[PDB]
Enzyme design. Sequence first.
Site, PDB file in Angstrom:
ATOM      1  CB  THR A  42      -0.846   0.039   1.274  1.00 34.30           C
ATOM      2  OG1 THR A  42      -1.765  -0.987   1.147  1.00 34.30           O
ATOM      3  CG2 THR A  42      -1.694   1.295   1.494  1.00 34.30           C
ATOM      4  CB  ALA A  67      -6.832  -6.665   3.603  1.00 31.33           C
TER       5      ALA A  67
HETATM    6  C1  04C Z   1      -0.095  -2.542   0.306  1.00 32.55           C
HETATM    7  C2  04C Z   1      -0.701  -3.122  -0.996  1.00 32.55           C
HETATM    8  C3  04C Z   1       0.789  -3.671   0.843  1.00 32.55           C
HETATM    9  O1  04C Z   1       1.862  -3.015   1.535  1.00 32.55           O
HETATM   10  C4  04C Z   1      -1.233  -2.253   1.401  1.00 32.55           C
HETATM   11  O2  04C Z   1      -0.663  -2.281   2.723  1.00 32.55           O
HETATM   12  C5  04C Z   1      -2.465  -3.180   1.386  1.00 32.55           C
HETATM   13  C6  04C Z   1      -3.578  -2.507   2.177  1.00 32.55           C
HETATM   14  C7  04C Z   1      -4.853  -3.055   1.914  1.00 32.55           C
HETATM   15  C8  04C Z   1      -5.914  -2.485   2.618  1.00 32.55           C
HETATM   16  C9  04C Z   1      -7.220  -2.932   2.450  1.00 32.55           C
HETATM   17  C10 04C Z   1      -7.483  -3.966   1.563  1.00 32.55           C
HETATM   18  C11 04C Z   1      -6.440  -4.546   0.847  1.00 32.55           C
HETATM   19  C12 04C Z   1      -5.133  -4.098   1.018  1.00 32.55           C
HETATM   20  N1  04C Z   1      -2.152  -4.439   2.052  1.00 32.55           N
HETATM   21  C13 04C Z   1      -2.113  -5.610   1.407  1.00 32.55           C
HETATM   22  O3  04C Z   1      -2.311  -5.776   0.205  1.00 32.55           O
HETATM   23  C14 04C Z   1      -1.789  -6.774   2.316  1.00 32.55           C
HETATM   24  C15 04C Z   1      -0.292  -6.888   2.451  1.00 32.55           C
HETATM   25  C16 04C Z   1      -0.122  -7.930   3.363  1.00 32.55           C
HETATM   26  C17 04C Z   1       0.232  -9.206   2.929  1.00 32.55           C
HETATM   27  C18 04C Z   1       0.381 -10.236   3.851  1.00 32.55           C
HETATM   28  C19 04C Z   1       0.170  -9.994   5.205  1.00 32.55           C
HETATM   29  O4  04C Z   1       0.319 -11.002   6.105  1.00 32.55           O
HETATM   30  C20 04C Z   1       1.401 -10.740   7.014  1.00 32.55           C
HETATM   31  C21 04C Z   1      -0.193  -8.721   5.640  1.00 32.55           C
HETATM   32  C22 04C Z   1      -0.336  -7.695   4.718  1.00 32.55           C
HETATM   33  N2  04C Z   1      -2.344  -8.016   1.761  1.00 32.55           N
HETATM   34  C23 04C Z   1      -3.281  -8.704   2.431  1.00 32.55           C
HETATM   35  O5  04C Z   1      -3.772  -8.357   3.507  1.00 32.55           O
HETATM   36  C24 04C Z   1      -3.739  -9.989   1.761  1.00 32.55           C
HETATM   37  C25 04C Z   1      -3.330 -11.193   2.613  1.00 32.55           C
HETATM   38  N3  04C Z   1      -5.195  -9.925   1.659  1.00 32.55           N
HETATM   39  C26 04C Z   1      -5.791  -9.496   0.540  1.00 32.55           C
HETATM   40  O6  04C Z   1      -5.179  -9.143  -0.465  1.00 32.55           O
HETATM   41  C27 04C Z   1      -7.325  -9.473   0.623  1.00 32.55           C
HETATM   42  N4  04C Z   1      -7.953  -9.613  -0.696  1.00 32.55           N
HETATM   43  C28 04C Z   1      -7.338 -10.637  -1.594  1.00 32.55           C
HETATM   44  C29 04C Z   1      -8.290 -11.019  -2.652  1.00 32.55           C
HETATM   45  O7  04C Z   1      -9.507 -11.469  -2.045  1.00 32.55           O
HETATM   46  C30 04C Z   1     -10.211 -10.351  -1.479  1.00 32.55           C
HETATM   47  C31 04C Z   1      -9.371  -9.888  -0.350  1.00 32.55           C
END
Ligand code: 04C
Lengths: 233, 211, 204, 226, 222, 195, 195, 196, 196
Positions: B1, B49
């Site tokens: 993000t 997320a």
């Molecule tokens: C940027 C893209 C990554 O640094 C940002 O922080 C986003 C923020 C965000 C906020 C709301 C919704 C979606 C994204 N974060 C992510 O993309 C996170 C990064 C992450 C990865 C792994 C983690 O575990 C330690 C923690 C953070 N990704 C996720 O949370 C990911 C696991 N979930 C999703 O992408 C949820 N989506 C995927 C597709 O199905 C629908 C939901």
Amino acid sequence: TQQPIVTGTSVISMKYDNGVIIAADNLGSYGSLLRFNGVERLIPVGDNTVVGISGDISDMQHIERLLKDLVTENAYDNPLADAEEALEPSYIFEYLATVMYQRRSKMNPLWNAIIVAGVQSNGDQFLRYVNLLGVTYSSPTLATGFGAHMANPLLRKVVDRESDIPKTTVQVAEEAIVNAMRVLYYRDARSSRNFSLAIIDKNTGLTFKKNLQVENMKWDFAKDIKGYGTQKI
Amino acid sequence: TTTLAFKFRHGVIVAADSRATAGAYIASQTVKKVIEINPYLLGTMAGGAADCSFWERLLARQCRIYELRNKERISVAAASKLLANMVYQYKGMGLSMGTMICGWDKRGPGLYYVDSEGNRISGATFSVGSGSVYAYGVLDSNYKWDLSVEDALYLGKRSILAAAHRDAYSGGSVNLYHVTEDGWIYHGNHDVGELFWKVKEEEGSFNNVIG
Amino acid sequence: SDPSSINGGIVVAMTGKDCVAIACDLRLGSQSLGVSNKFEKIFHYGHVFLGITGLATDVTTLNEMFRYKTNLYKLKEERAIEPETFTQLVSSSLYERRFGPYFVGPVVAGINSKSGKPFIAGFDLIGCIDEAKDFIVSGTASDQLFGMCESLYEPNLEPEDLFETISQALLNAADRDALSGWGAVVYIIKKDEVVKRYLKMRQD
Amino acid sequence: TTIVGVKFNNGVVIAADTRSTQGPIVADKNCAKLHRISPKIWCAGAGTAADTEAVTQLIGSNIELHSLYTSREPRVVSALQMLKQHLFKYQGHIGAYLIVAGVDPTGSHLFSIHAHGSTDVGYYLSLGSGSLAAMAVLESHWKQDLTKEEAIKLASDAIQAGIWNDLGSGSNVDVCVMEIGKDAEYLRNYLTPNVREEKQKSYKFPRGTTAVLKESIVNICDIQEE
Amino acid sequence: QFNPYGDNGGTILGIAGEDFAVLAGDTRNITDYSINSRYEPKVFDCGDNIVMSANGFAADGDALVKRFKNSVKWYHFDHNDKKLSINSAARNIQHLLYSRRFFPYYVYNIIAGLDEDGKGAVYSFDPVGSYQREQCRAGGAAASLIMPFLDNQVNFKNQYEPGTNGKVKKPLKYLSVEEVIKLVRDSFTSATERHIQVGDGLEILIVTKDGVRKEFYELKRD
Amino acid sequence: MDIILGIRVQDSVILASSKAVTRGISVLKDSDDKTRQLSPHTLMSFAGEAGDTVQFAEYIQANIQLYSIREDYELSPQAVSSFVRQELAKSIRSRRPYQVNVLIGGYDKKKNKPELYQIDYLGTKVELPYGAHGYSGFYTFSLLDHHYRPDMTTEEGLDLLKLCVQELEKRMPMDFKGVIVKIVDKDGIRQVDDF
Amino acid sequence: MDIILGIRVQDSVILASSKAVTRGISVLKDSDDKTRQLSPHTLMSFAGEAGDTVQFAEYIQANIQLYSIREDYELSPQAVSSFVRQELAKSIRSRRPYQVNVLIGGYDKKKNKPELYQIDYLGTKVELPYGAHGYSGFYTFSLLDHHYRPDMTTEEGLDLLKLCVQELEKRMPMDFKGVIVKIVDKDGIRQVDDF
Amino acid sequence: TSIMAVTFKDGVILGADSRTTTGAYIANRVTDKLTRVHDKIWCCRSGSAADTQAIADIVQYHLELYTSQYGTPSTETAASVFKELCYENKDNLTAGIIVAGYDDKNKGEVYTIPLGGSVHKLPYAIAGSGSTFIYGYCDKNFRENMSKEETVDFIKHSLSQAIKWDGSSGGVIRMVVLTAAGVERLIFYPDEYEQL
Amino acid sequence: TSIMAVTFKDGVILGADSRTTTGAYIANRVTDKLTRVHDKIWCCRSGSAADTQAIADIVQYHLELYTSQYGTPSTETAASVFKELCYENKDNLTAGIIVAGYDDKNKGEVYTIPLGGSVHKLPYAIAGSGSTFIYGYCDKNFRENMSKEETVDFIKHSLSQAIKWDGSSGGVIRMVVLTAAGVERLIFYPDEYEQL
Ligand SMILES: *[C@@](C)(CO)[C@](*)(O)[C@H](Cc1ccccc1)NC(=O)[C@H](Cc1ccc(OC)cc1)NC(=O)[C@@H](C)NC(=O)CN1CCOCC1
Ligand SMILES: *[C@@](C)(CO)[C@](*)(O)[C@H](Cc1ccccc1)NC(=O)[C@H](Cc1ccc(OC)cc1)NC(=O)[C@@H](C)NC(=O)CN1CCOCC1
Ligand SMILES: [Mg+2]
Ligand SMILES: [Mg+2]
Ligand SMILES: [Mg+2]
Ligand SMILES: [Mg+2]
Ligand SMILES: [Mg+2]
Ligand SMILES: [Mg+2]
């Protein structure tokens, strides 16, 4: 969390036109030690279900008691306990599947792989698998442990898909199971020659065969094998 | 993000990208990282997320009850504090949240940074996420208080673009918001693919890139 | 930490009717950071083309090494090396570092100057040859490329059609990979003419 | 992989599947696992693909030179010995698991060899991730005094068991038959039970669909005269 | 040490039309390199014109579906047989998932149906409850193989109109159910080729105002 | 060491390198010059682990100076950068690799063009209009992406550099004690004494 | 957080606390006030792990304000410091201890004396003429040991504090973005707006 | 693995099972663990198959070269060569070898070489994972100067029990008889020995 | 430890060695591993001495209370109480128990309860570290419906070998005879059993 101590190896099974067959050897291993030679791992529940269990034997004996208690409990205030409201294979399985998943969710699993084989009220074949993780699946052939790797391939040559089930007779199905048990005796280091076999037919009912042996084994060719490469004598 | 927000004379701008990642794989490119708490309150999402979404929606329900009990809209300071105290219970348990509570209350425009680590900071300018470091450069150099709404919206948009370009885990599209005393106003979804080329031509920037 | 995914990047090659195509992205990164949008991963030694993905220092190093070896080959043999022969040279050179390997995913593409037969091949980092008829993929979006190539590809495509297929395979795979993109190049190769096209893609 | 070796009356036969994997992904759908050491000595390999190829080429090269030095046709026991001593020296770090078979002036031979350098003898053998599915078939149907035609069937049936029931194995069946007093016949793609069905749609694009920035001719020719 | 999680493979795919929605998934169930079943259903009719699939760890997937079906049952009891809208189901599922934030359901979940305006709807979930509505989404083992293909053939990404040369995009024309099912079958046929955990069979559930229909297609069994 | 920047403008290359040297919780020096003149029109700045940095830079310096004497000819910045890269690519698979990242700024007198090369400790070489090593680029690249033109004057490059440094001084937690700035052009190498 | 200082002079207590808040490689704020007024003549500065610091300080603040209301009486700085120490000594053997170090500066209106207490996260209390937490004291104690007198004026204390801060700014690798200075005396608590 | 060597009146007999395992899978069920290093000097192998094969091959080389120069080697000499390899490379080997041979002068001799590389000359020896279960039986039933038929029955009964209890042991029972008369190979199948 | 229980014509006999070790040191050389839980229901203990003592004490309590309410318990009932403790507390125990008892109705019965908490009813049972060395001997020499004197000789010879090979086993051989006649304690010293 634990580790399995006294263990039972493969349980194998398959569907045929009028019912199901299930089999398992009579061994209770203690690591590499072939400790107990008279262990029954197929446990009938009523006259329409056989539960085959592999994995930890102490947990198997616990499950055996749960099933025995289940029959007792079903008979309570139940005039149709030996008729319409008798225990079905699907009831027995779902109960075990509930228990297995609950136990894994408390990080204290029943270290087993279970196959519930039986025939329902309407004559439909029932064959479903459940294990320590609570993972469930159904297939025309099912096998646990080494049986999954060696027996399934052989049994799937007889019943490759659902449409092959009506074309498969009890004689052919039993022949395939018995052959699979021989192959497992050749190749599984934690297996025994002695085994039990159970047939649940919608017409002839439950036939439980004990004290079966693997026979017609091929060993003669061993005499010709000498050394590990260059040795002639 | 990449997410950012800043206070200024005419309220507070809130901008964010739309990329979601699962390792190197881009899971989604259309996610809403801005949360609609109430018509006068916004929340950003960065990190987990699921965590951000769940706790902020929980916050929103908390804020609504507040309005019913007290016959009055909650302050930005109190809202951010409810979140902070809620996530502080689960400190060290694995939560991953980096958020900004943006709104307008009796004290004027308000902006609070809140994270799962326990920080709760009031500030005129924030940017959180993997691409925050790229966005800060553009903000700090162009940020003023006497900024027009038109110029302010562009600044927040241009800052996200800067990060989306460089950061591999930021991109997709830009979502814009403007928070006034009469409530928040959504200023659209802007595809970075198309936006990049447009900005390159009109601004002259990104000379090193060929187009 | 994983050397094969620090710098990022992708390469894909396809066969057509009396032609081959090889394409790559232009990104060079330091994990999340994009460093260069001009890091071409495709090189050629005479009429034989080599695309290399993986660790950028090894990509650069192997190019310089195969330029070295092909220049000597030519001086001694008095002829340019062919794709089938070069493929074996790549395999040999990679396996000689079996227990301290170059962290790369090479892809050979070219047309035999004598037989006129189109040729592509891929390798693992230690030299195992994958001589495919249809296509070869390599990089951080190899899974994505496999999905695109396996569904979009059809045999005996003409150069100008093959161009569109390989370009779309690359572009859409790259747009589902964080570590690939920032530009793209496609080489269209025929027996005695080669065209190089830079693609327009999203820069995020 | 799934690979097998089966002896019969007047020779020996080996077979293999044609799938290579990178984790859950299939890298090559028509891979060649049957390698030639010498004209009448072939080996099938499982494990690290580069190692099985490299170790086979090396020993095959040294076998050829040995054959020239001795003015004799190479023996399977020579290839066996050279392989196991090489593999043993590298203490299993060369992940080559091979089934070696062939015919020579001594007769027909069938061996298996493991990455650490242990060898085995047999009338029927199987290696790879599908070795158990294949061995189940071999243990069910193998018999003494097989004919050439019975052995090829048994071998390919064993490979099929692996193809269908093992996820590490798939696609096609390769076979090589080594009979005494004959040339060895290498049957590439002996069976093809996994042809992809026709796609529902054509994804051929209209020309001009892709956006382009620059075009240029690439000079592949040498420096010109005049 | 006891590992409470497992990987049963499989891949699922949800596509939303203008007045319909599909949810497809292969019928193969696996552990490591073995096949458990060539036909083990993975996509379910949960009631109220909603279909659902929880892909990954089958034991957790079965439990989640079982709970959601139960949530639908009690929604009727408690709210006068009111129909559970797709947007309401999605929010309910978020809370089912996050109730296990510190011992997650190891599954990627997709639901499909129709929104309150009658248009096609697909919702995608992560294992801990983050959801979003989408037009196109593949989940599971071969998700990375399929999604780029759908970006290209459903949303017409990186596709422009010939003659303009990158100046004008390809317009976003809606797809029919017959066109969608072709993309689904080609997606799974391509995935089956290059992914070892995908194959055996393909079961598709189509949702319209008329109800829920099924379609089954064989896949390669290697 | 911490921050090293580089920017190639119209007719010169500007290298900015931090002045601080740190051993644990103590700043040992606040006027350290993290650069070596390889040849009259080629300058290399460097940053990495203590010892490795200076040992490598001076080893390279000696090799280029040896070449210059032997041939009575200055190597091109491209030739020098390739020599350096090979030494680092050789180093990374050695028993104990040099943990050094470098920027090579030079003026090619043959082509009458300034050139800037960025090379990391792995031997990853890239020619750039502007570059940075470590956590520096993270803060500065957004400003450079915005303001940079290839037709910039040396004075315009320095103003853009001041802006980059000002951003570093605001958002970096570490105090790097300002920077030493050096310009490489046709007339050679000189230091900006007031920055 | 980073640096918190304290010095007790003749008729007052001076607390100096850094302004910076940092999350990883980014300075989030450069004007953070790391202090809470516990009572009109008692001020507590604090530093430690994020969240714990403010949660603890405000928890203490609430308890002292509650006491003040209940009794209509201000607790002595010594009583407050003992209450705080007990809370930290209770905390250290809990499931998750507060990771906070504090300085309590107060003016005892009964004794007409300023008082400074240093308490670390373990519940280690000590009354001092001057004190510091973390790596601060390491640089500053030599100057305080040299220049400090108990009969110093508030203005002399501030000059000595400037000297301590100047030394920190020279030898500390971390940029803490200056300090907020507060004085506690008979007339209450006030902030020095220019430092 | 279950292996043993027993001296008797006319010479010595080696005995072994035929099972080789990779974990719980039986990689080979008709293995020949009785290996020849010289005309009338054989060994029984236990431990790593790769290690024991490489060792036995080297020993066979040494004894072939010994014979070319100095004539027929003693069984003690053969055991010394085994030992020298097993002892000096103990950090990189996992080999448990029983050496057995017949001279006309020394008659039947048995040497056992466990993991460390030590040598022990014995009337009879047992080794392998399955030997643990027959220490009691073999000690109670062994006599010196048994007949050929008595010794065959002793080995057959002993290995029968080892196979019965050890899952790593099984298959057929192979035996090698070493006397002045020559070298005789024997084999006994499950249906014979299981019913004992 | 070396323990066994054997059924015969007139009832059942328990047998055990008397050695307890702390590593290689013998903490007690005259241990009594044959413990009474009821008049004619005894057990043999193996594993953790603390665990097996705590278990046997609890079982003795349960059976004393059972007897007060319901009369003399069966040997199966005793084995069930052992099992219930061993199985439900398997994560915190290291106990290998053999239960043996005499009824007039059921006569001599033997139950073994290994580490997991499973129960196995057998004609005879062996357990402890030293049991491994006598699986072969005991299987070959056990017969059903032996006489008292035959059964005593069987246990004596069996444990003699277990002690001979197992360093964790040794000392004297204690035995307990359970018949209708009553309860007879036996003891056999090294000088007697070593020369067998
Ligand atoms: C940027 C893209 C990554 O640094 C940002 O922080 C986003 C923020 C965000 C906020 C709301 C919704 C979606 C994204 N974060 C992510 O993309 C996170 C990064 C992450 C990865 C792994 C983690 O575990 C330690 C923690 C953070 N990704 C996720 O949370 C990911 C696991 N979930 C999703 O992408 C949820 N989506 C995927 C597709 O199905 C629908 C939901
Ligand atoms: C079946 C497929 C086993 O899965 C079979 O053994 C084949 C054998 C084979 C033989 C000749 C040509 C092609 C295939 N093996 C493979 O397909 C292997 C699987 C494998 C992967 C990784 C391994 O290291 C732990 C070992 C085996 N494939 C490959 O070797 C090939 C795709 N290369 C790689 O995956 C790269 N290796 C290189 C060395 O380090 C790890 C990755
Ligand atoms: Mg709260
Ligand atoms: Mg990006
Ligand atoms: Mg397969
Ligand atoms: Mg203190
Ligand atoms: Mg056995
Ligand atoms: Mg003893």
